[PDB]
Amino acid sequence: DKEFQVLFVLTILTLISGTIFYSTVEGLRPIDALWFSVVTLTTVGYGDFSPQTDFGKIFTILYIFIGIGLVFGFIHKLAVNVQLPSILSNLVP
Amino acid sequence: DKEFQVLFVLTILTLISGTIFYSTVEGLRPIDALWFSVVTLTTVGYGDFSPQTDFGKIFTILYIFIGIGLVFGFIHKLAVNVQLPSILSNLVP
Amino acid sequence: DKEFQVLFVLTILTLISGTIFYSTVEGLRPIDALWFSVVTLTTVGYGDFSPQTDFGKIFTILYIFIGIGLVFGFIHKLAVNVQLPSILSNLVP
Amino acid sequence: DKEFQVLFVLTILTLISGTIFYSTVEGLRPIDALWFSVVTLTTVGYGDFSPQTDFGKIFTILYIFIGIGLVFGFIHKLAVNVQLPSILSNLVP
Ligand SMILES: [K+]
Ligand SMILES: [K+]
Ligand SMILES: [K+]
Ligand SMILES: [K+]
User: Fold this and answer.
1) Contact A50, A70 (CB under 8 A)
2) Is C35 helix (H, G, I), strand (E, B) or coil?
3) Taking a C-beta distance cutoff of 8 angstroms, is the pair D67, D41 a contact?
4) CA nearest C38: which of D57, A41, A48, B49?
5) A33 vs A48: CA distance, rounded Å
6) Which member of C45, C48, C87 has the closest CB to residue D6?
7) In contact, D55 and D25? CB cutoff 8 Å
8) Contact D44 A46 (CB under 8 A)
9) How many angstroms separate the Cα of B72 from the Cα of each of B83, B86, C29?
10) Which molecular-function annotations from GO does this UniProt entry contain (chains A, B, C, D) (predicted)?
């Protein structure tokens, strides 16, 4: 609970920061900026969008090193503290 | 066994859900929809396909956060509870 | 040693299998086939190459689920049993 | 501290080595060479850049197997020994 909540808030703030940056510096729509932020921090990287400016590339490097840690943390706790118990509870007939 | 079976079923259902969504909203062939779902949840992300609609992008964001946890879980148990023993058994002359 | 050797051989065989498949079914040069196999199993996925046939896509799905487990295993042991000690040994003045 | 410092230096050197290689063999700007090195070793892989020469592809294969181990190590310690405590310290009213 309290741990998953913190991680949830930290993830939300991280994605908000990305959305604001890419819509500003790279000129993306806010929706596309959020899309790029997620596709980046989860390391999926389709490359349908990518930073065209040097500022954009430099920020993204730092965004990645800082962002991956907490994003996968959230993903991990979400799966281990939320999804796991639920699946088990559904396996009791 | 019982753990790997559950994870196997959960993975199958997850991929089925993706196949139905992308063939519907993004208009992909069912085979290409399954292909995108896998390439997404394993975080490979070639970008040969990517969602063009806003609905598609929003769903994929949620699909990723929810899907990665179980997909890598399956991958992990598959390697640790199935592949590992087999390799060891083949190393006894 | 014996563990890292096994993992090394298993990785080599896996990459050889990929090289043969993609040069055959997708018609890539052997070098490009090996390149795609690695870029796939390490989950990097540039998408400079991607399978164009349905056979190619179906095989790759299976290749991914089976291959990621051992490839990251090798990567892990390589870093924990080989790179780690070496760095420490270089930190003794 | 001493552990995070070492990992920090090892990461810096790894990225420097990549920058020099890609600007030399693939003819990228130094900034784009660093960009590719990071996007590669964190496994994001946008594919906005990718090696066009066989030398480039062969080196990158080796760069990946060697580089991922330490890069994610740094990312891990950064998140567990630096980001984690800080967030907790900010949660004390
Ligand atoms: K990727
Ligand atoms: K990618
Ligand atoms: K890509
Ligand atoms: K990845």
Assistant:
1) no
2) helix
3) yes
4) D57
5) 12
6) C87
7) yes
8) no
9) 15, 20, 31
10) identical protein binding; metal ion binding; potassium channel activity
Residues 6+ apart with CB under 8 A from D84: none
How remote is the CA of residue B55 from the centroid of ligand 4, in Å? 23
- Which residues of chain C make contact with D42, given a CB cutoff of 8 A? none
**In the Cβ-directed half-sphere of A46, how many Cα atoms lie within 13 Å?**
23
Q: Which domain holds residue D19?
A: 1-93
Q: Which residues on B lie below 8 Å from A37 (Cβ)? A: none
Scored b (16 or more CB within 10 A) or e, D25-37 reads bbebeeebbbbbb
**CA-CA distance, B56 to B36, in Å (whole number)?**
12
3-state secondary structure of B47: coil
> C42–D50: do the CB atoms touch at under 8 Å?
no
- Token representation of residue C84: 């780690």
Question: What resolution in angstroms does the PDB record give?
Answer: 1.9
Experimentally determined by: X-ray
Helix (H), strand (E), coil (C) string for chain D: CHHHHHHHHHHHHHHHHHHHHHHHHCCCCHHHHHHHHHHHHCCCCCCCCCCCCHHHHHHHHHHHHHHHHHHHHHHHHHHHHHHHHHHHHCCCC
Distances (CA, A) of B47 to A31, A44, B28, C78, D39: 18, 9, 14, 30, 15
Structure tokens at D69: 């181990």
Specify the residue for token string 């399954």.
B34
Residue with tokens 């480039």: D56
Yes or no: say if A10 and A88 are a contact pair by the CB < 8 Å rule. Answer: no
